[PDB]
Protein backbone atom coordinates (compact mmCIF):
# COMPACT_ATOMS: atom_id res chain seq x y z
CA UNK A 1 0.00 0.00 0.00
CA UNK A 2 1.13 3.12 -0.58
CA UNK A 3 1.13 4.57 3.10
CA UNK A 4 2.26 1.42 5.40
CA UNK A 5 2.30 0.60 9.01
CA UNK A 6 6.52 0.91 9.86
CA UNK A 7 6.99 3.18 6.69
CA UNK A 8 5.79 6.87 7.29
CA UNK A 9 4.00 6.07 10.44
CA UNK A 10 4.16 3.25 13.04
CA UNK A 11 0.93 2.03 15.08
CA UNK A 12 1.01 2.42 18.91
CA UNK A 13 1.39 -1.33 20.90
CA UNK A 14 -0.72 0.61 23.58
CA UNK A 15 -3.69 3.02 21.88
CA UNK A 16 -4.51 5.93 23.91
CA UNK A 17 -8.39 6.27 24.44
CA UNK A 18 -9.20 10.26 24.63
CA UNK A 19 -6.13 11.92 23.38
CA UNK A 20 -6.31 14.70 21.56
CA UNK A 21 -6.81 14.55 17.19
CA UNK A 22 -3.50 15.58 16.39
CA UNK A 23 -0.80 16.39 19.10
CA UNK A 24 2.63 17.05 18.21
CA UNK A 25 5.47 17.33 21.01
CA UNK A 26 8.23 19.33 21.14
CA UNK A 27 11.42 20.94 22.87
CA UNK A 28 13.27 24.65 22.93
CA UNK A 29 16.40 22.43 23.39
CA UNK A 30 16.06 19.99 20.54
CA UNK A 31 17.70 20.70 17.21
CA UNK A 32 15.49 18.83 15.14
CA UNK A 33 12.35 21.26 16.37
CA UNK A 34 14.45 24.34 15.78
CA UNK A 35 14.02 23.11 12.21
CA UNK A 36 10.42 21.75 12.27
CA UNK A 37 9.23 25.11 13.22
CA UNK A 38 11.85 27.30 12.00
CA UNK A 39 12.86 26.11 8.88
CA UNK A 40 9.84 23.74 7.36
CA UNK A 41 7.01 25.09 9.54
CA UNK A 42 5.34 21.68 10.24
CA UNK A 43 2.94 22.24 12.84
CA UNK A 44 1.40 25.43 10.17
CA UNK A 45 1.40 23.30 6.97
CA UNK A 46 0.07 20.06 8.68
CA UNK A 47 -2.97 22.33 9.85
CA UNK A 48 -3.20 23.82 6.75
CA UNK A 49 -4.06 20.24 5.35
CA UNK A 50 -6.02 19.24 8.07
CA UNK A 51 -9.84 18.01 8.00
CA UNK A 52 -12.30 20.84 9.20
CA UNK A 53 -13.35 19.58 12.87
CA UNK A 54 -9.74 18.29 13.68
CA UNK A 55 -8.11 20.24 16.58
CA UNK A 56 -4.24 20.68 16.89
CA UNK A 57 -2.32 20.28 20.62
CA UNK A 58 1.57 20.85 20.71
CA UNK A 59 3.47 20.50 23.97
CA UNK A 60 6.74 21.13 25.73
CA UNK A 61 8.75 18.43 27.48
CA UNK A 62 10.98 18.00 30.37
CA UNK A 63 12.98 15.46 29.46
CA UNK A 64 15.53 17.97 27.64
CA UNK A 65 17.75 20.14 29.27
CA UNK A 66 17.28 19.60 32.94
CA UNK A 67 16.51 22.52 35.02
CA UNK A 68 15.52 24.76 32.29
CA UNK A 69 13.67 22.65 30.50
CA UNK A 70 11.41 22.60 32.99
CA UNK A 71 11.19 26.18 33.08
CA UNK A 72 10.30 26.06 29.00
CA UNK A 73 7.62 23.64 29.62
CA UNK A 74 5.96 25.97 32.03
CA UNK A 75 6.39 28.98 30.11
CA UNK A 76 4.36 27.33 27.59
CA UNK A 77 2.08 26.79 29.62
CA UNK A 78 2.15 30.54 30.32
CA UNK A 79 2.35 31.02 26.13
CA UNK A 80 -0.97 28.92 25.64
CA UNK A 81 -3.05 30.14 28.73
CA UNK A 82 -2.10 33.45 27.20
CA UNK A 83 -2.74 32.34 23.90
CA UNK A 84 1.18 34.05 22.59
CA UNK A 85 2.56 30.59 20.90
CA UNK A 86 2.56 32.93 17.66
CA UNK A 87 4.93 35.69 19.44
CA UNK A 88 7.24 33.26 21.56
CA UNK A 89 7.82 30.52 19.98
CA UNK A 90 10.73 31.92 17.12
CA UNK A 91 12.62 33.90 20.08
CA UNK A 92 12.41 31.28 22.78
CA UNK A 93 14.35 28.50 19.67
CA UNK A 94 16.61 31.28 18.89
CA UNK A 95 17.62 32.29 22.43
CA UNK A 96 18.06 28.79 23.26
CA UNK A 97 19.97 27.53 19.84
CA UNK A 98 20.71 30.59 18.11
CA UNK A 99 22.09 33.31 20.43
CA UNK A 100 22.75 31.02 23.70
CA UNK A 101 21.12 34.05 25.52
CA UNK A 102 18.10 31.94 27.80
CA UNK A 103 19.79 30.75 31.03
CA UNK A 104 17.82 31.12 33.64
CA UNK A 105 13.88 31.56 34.33
CA UNK A 106 14.37 35.21 34.14
CA UNK A 107 16.00 34.61 30.34
CA UNK A 108 12.69 33.26 29.74
CA UNK A 109 10.67 36.03 30.98
CA UNK A 110 12.34 38.80 29.12
CA UNK A 111 11.55 37.22 25.43
CA UNK A 112 7.81 37.25 26.66
CA UNK A 113 8.08 40.98 28.18
CA UNK A 114 9.86 41.92 25.12
CA UNK A 115 6.83 40.18 22.51
CA UNK A 116 4.64 42.49 24.45
CA UNK A 117 3.34 40.26 27.44
CA UNK A 118 2.89 42.60 30.17
CA UNK A 119 5.19 41.99 33.42
CA UNK A 120 2.46 41.42 35.83
CA UNK A 121 0.08 39.47 33.41
CA UNK A 122 3.57 37.12 32.61
CA UNK A 123 3.94 36.59 36.54
CA UNK A 124 0.13 35.69 37.59
CA UNK A 125 -0.10 33.37 34.38
CA UNK A 126 2.99 31.79 35.66
CA UNK A 127 2.23 31.50 39.16
CA UNK A 128 -1.14 30.55 38.35
CA UNK A 129 -2.78 27.71 39.23
CA UNK A 130 -4.52 27.23 35.43
CA UNK A 131 -0.77 27.25 34.69
CA UNK A 132 -0.28 24.32 36.74
CA UNK A 133 -2.70 22.81 35.25
CA UNK A 134 -1.65 22.80 31.47
CA UNK A 135 1.66 22.21 33.10
CA UNK A 136 0.19 18.38 34.48
CA UNK A 137 -1.55 18.24 31.27
CA UNK A 138 1.39 18.20 29.29
CA UNK A 139 3.39 15.75 31.13
CA UNK A 140 0.16 13.48 31.24
CA UNK A 141 0.20 13.02 27.62
CA UNK A 142 3.84 12.63 27.27
CA UNK A 143 3.75 10.10 29.91
CA UNK A 144 0.70 8.60 28.33
CA UNK A 145 2.58 7.32 25.12
CA UNK A 146 5.71 6.87 27.29
CA UNK A 147 7.40 10.18 25.64
CA UNK A 148 11.44 9.32 24.48
CA UNK A 149 12.21 11.65 21.89
CA UNK A 150 11.16 14.87 20.09
CA UNK A 151 10.22 15.94 18.01
CA UNK A 152 6.91 13.66 17.48
CA UNK A 153 3.26 13.81 16.79
CA UNK A 154 0.30 11.42 17.25
CA UNK A 155 -2.79 11.22 15.67
CA UNK A 156 -5.97 9.92 17.82
CA UNK A 157 -3.48 8.46 20.04
CA UNK A 158 -2.76 5.56 17.66
CA UNK A 159 -1.00 6.35 14.86
CA UNK A 160 3.04 7.70 15.29
CA UNK A 161 4.83 9.96 12.08
CA UNK A 162 7.94 8.31 10.76
CA UNK A 163 9.99 11.38 9.27
CA UNK A 164 12.51 8.96 8.87
CA UNK A 165 10.81 6.80 6.14
CA UNK A 166 10.55 10.20 4.49
CA UNK A 167 12.56 11.75 1.67
CA UNK A 168 14.44 14.75 2.81
CA UNK A 169 16.70 15.52 -0.39
CA UNK A 170 13.98 18.51 -1.14
CA UNK A 171 12.53 20.27 1.60
CA UNK A 172 9.27 21.32 0.24
CA UNK A 173 8.23 17.46 -0.67
CA UNK A 174 9.55 16.15 2.64
CA UNK A 175 7.07 18.75 4.80
CA UNK A 176 4.10 18.00 2.29
CA UNK A 177 4.13 13.85 2.52
CA UNK A 178 4.78 14.59 6.32
CA UNK A 179 0.94 16.75 6.00
CA UNK A 180 -0.34 14.45 3.53
CA UNK A 181 0.39 11.54 6.36
CA UNK A 182 -1.28 13.41 8.95
CA UNK A 183 -4.34 13.87 6.95
CA UNK A 184 -4.51 10.43 5.83
CA UNK A 185 -4.04 9.22 9.45
CA UNK A 186 -6.52 11.75 10.81
CA UNK A 187 -9.03 9.55 8.27
CA UNK A 188 -8.70 5.98 9.22
C1 LIG B 1 14.14 18.03 6.22
C2 LIG B 1 14.38 17.43 7.61
C3 LIG B 1 13.95 16.23 7.92
C4 LIG B 1 14.18 15.65 9.31
O1 LIG B 1 13.71 14.35 9.56
C5 LIG B 1 13.66 13.93 10.90
C6 LIG B 1 14.47 12.99 11.35
C7 LIG B 1 14.38 12.53 12.80
C8 LIG B 1 13.49 13.06 13.60
C9 LIG B 1 13.37 12.61 15.06
C10 LIG B 1 14.71 12.72 15.77
O2 LIG B 1 15.57 11.81 15.58
O3 LIG B 1 14.94 13.70 16.54
C11 LIG B 1 12.55 14.14 13.08
C12 LIG B 1 12.62 14.55 11.83
C13 LIG B 1 14.82 16.36 10.22
C14 LIG B 1 15.32 17.75 9.86
C15 LIG B 1 15.12 18.25 8.66
C16 LIG B 1 15.60 19.64 8.30
N1 LIG B 1 15.95 20.68 8.01
Redesign the pocket.
Known amino acids: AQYEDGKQYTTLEKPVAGAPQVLEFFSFF?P?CY??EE??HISDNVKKKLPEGVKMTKYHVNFMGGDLGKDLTQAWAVAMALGVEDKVTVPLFEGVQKTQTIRSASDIRDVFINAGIKGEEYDAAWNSFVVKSLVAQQEKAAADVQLR???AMFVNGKYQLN??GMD?SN?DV?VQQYADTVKYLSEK
Open positions: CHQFVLGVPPQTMF
